[PDB]
């Protein structure tokens, strides 16, 4: 049997042309002669544009709709159909016919979505230390028909508030998302990943940002395990510091003033000479950075022992 062979769906540029494929399947085991080809909108009161045998083409407004490969004189099976400048109006189902004999007249529906590929952004907001969940990172897909899905994923998953205004070209809508959580030190560097996933993709597509929260020091000290003993080798601690920005200034002191003087700073490190006699300090280093500065406590003790 003869039967008419189009996809279900087709898409469906705003503004762009699409071809509407329509084909003739027939068995090489049997005869038909097809007359005529319509393709008409859905209930439209009669057709859009039509194609025949001998008499060739005909259209409803011209400037528009071209029959891609029905050719006049040959043996119509391709009633694949082009129209140019897609706009919103002209998403619906339409109807391709062909008027074969002597089967009669086979006919498909075709879906035409009409779609707009949005292209899209994210930022990273910047946050200070603020008590409230704030924005800290936005994404925005501009442009998109049908809307865009925003999804956000991340280690550390917040709260995402998204919204969307209208487009540019009529129909499209740009969706803009962003990611609201309560900004902590730990966050500051980690990456948070926007999804913008739209059925025009090749692949829901990934966009990454750097959080940043700015913070002051927070600071430990470390180098030090119990077994320090008398006339040992120069051992050295660091002052471990991560702030946002990056600390200014290191300062280092004691629970007691000044420095004893076997221990030298070295910038961000106290480097701790070899003891005639035993002593204990507590320690502190003062780490300034551009807002504020904080510090740790670490008391140190050398003993004779082995
Ligand atoms: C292009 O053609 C498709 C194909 O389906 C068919 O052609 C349509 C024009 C129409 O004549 C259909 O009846 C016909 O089979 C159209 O897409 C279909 O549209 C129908 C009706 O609008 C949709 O029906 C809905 O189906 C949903 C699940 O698939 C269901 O959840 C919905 O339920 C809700 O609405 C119904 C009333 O429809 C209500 O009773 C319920 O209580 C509930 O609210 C609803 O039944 C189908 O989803 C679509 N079918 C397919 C296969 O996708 C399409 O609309 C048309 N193109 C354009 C641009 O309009
Ligand atoms: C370095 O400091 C230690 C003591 O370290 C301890 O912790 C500090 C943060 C301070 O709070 C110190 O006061 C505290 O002791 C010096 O050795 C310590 O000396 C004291 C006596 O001056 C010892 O007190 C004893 O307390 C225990 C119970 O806890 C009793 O059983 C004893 O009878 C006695 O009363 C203290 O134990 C002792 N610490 C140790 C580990 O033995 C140390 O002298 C000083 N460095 C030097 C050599 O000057
Ligand atoms: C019925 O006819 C239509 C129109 O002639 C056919 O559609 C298009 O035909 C062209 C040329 O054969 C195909 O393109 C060729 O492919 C590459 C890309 O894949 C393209 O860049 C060049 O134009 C190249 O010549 C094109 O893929 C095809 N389009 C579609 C939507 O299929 C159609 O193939 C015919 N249908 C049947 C069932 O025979
Ligand atoms: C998010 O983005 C920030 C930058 O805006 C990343 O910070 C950078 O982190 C790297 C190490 O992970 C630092 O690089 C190291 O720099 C030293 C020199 O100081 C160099 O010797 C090492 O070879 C290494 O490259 C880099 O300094 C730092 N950038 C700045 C401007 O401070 C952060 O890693 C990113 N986080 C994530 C999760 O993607
Ligand atoms: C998502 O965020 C928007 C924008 O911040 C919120 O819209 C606010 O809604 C509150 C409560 O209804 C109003 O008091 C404010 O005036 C709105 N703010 C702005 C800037 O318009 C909205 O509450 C959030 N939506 C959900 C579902 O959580
Ligand atoms: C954090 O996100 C960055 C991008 O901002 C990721 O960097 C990409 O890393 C891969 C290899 O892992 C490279 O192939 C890409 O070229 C990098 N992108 C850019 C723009 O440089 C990074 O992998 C992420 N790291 C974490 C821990 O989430
Ligand atoms: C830490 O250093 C800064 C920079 O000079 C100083 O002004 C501040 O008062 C210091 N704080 C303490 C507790 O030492």
């Given at each position: 049997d003869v039967v008419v062979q189009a996809p279900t769906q087709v898409p469906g540029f705003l503004g762009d042309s699409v071809t509407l494929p329509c084909y003739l399947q027939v068995p090489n085991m049997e005869v038909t002669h097809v007359s005529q080809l319509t393709w008409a909108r859905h209930?439209?009161?009669?057709?859009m544009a039509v194609f025949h045998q001998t008499q060739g083409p005909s259209y409803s407004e011209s400037k528009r709709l071209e029959f891609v490969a029905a050719r006049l004189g040959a043996e119509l099976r391709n009633a694949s159909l082009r129209m140019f400048?897609?706009?919103?109006?002209?998403e619906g189902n339409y109807t391709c016919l062909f008027v074969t004999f002597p089967q009669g007249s086979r006919s498909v529906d075709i879906w035409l979505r009409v779609l707009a590929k949005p292209q899209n952004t994210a930022e990273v907001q910047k946050v200070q230390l603020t008590g409230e969940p704030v924005p800290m990172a936005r994404c925005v897909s501009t442009g998109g028909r049908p809307p865009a899905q925003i999804t956000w994923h991340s280690d550390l998953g917040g709260m995402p508030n998204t919204s969307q205004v209208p487009g540019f070209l009529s129909g499209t809508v740009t969706v803009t998302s962003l990611w609201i959580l309560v900004p902590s030190?730990?966050?500051?560097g980690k990456n948070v990943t926007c999804k913008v996933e739209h059925?025009?993709?090749?692949?829901?597509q990934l966009l990454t940002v750097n959080l940043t929260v700015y913070y002051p020091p927070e600071v430990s000290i470390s180098?030090?395990?119990?077994?320090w003993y008398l006339g040992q080798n120069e051992a050295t601690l660091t002052c471990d510091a991560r702030s946002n920005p990056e600390p200014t200034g290191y300062n280092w002191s004691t629970t007691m003033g000044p420095l004893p003087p076997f221990a030298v700073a070295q910038g961000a490190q106290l480097l701790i000479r070899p003891v005639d006699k035993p002593i204990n300090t507590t320690l502190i280093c003062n780490v300034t950075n551009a807002l504020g500065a904080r510090q740790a406590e670490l008391t140190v003790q050398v003993k004779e022992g082995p």
């Open positions: 209930g439209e009161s009669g057709s400048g897609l706009r919103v109006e002209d030190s730990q966050v500051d059925e025009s993709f090749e692949k829901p180098g030090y395990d119990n077994n």
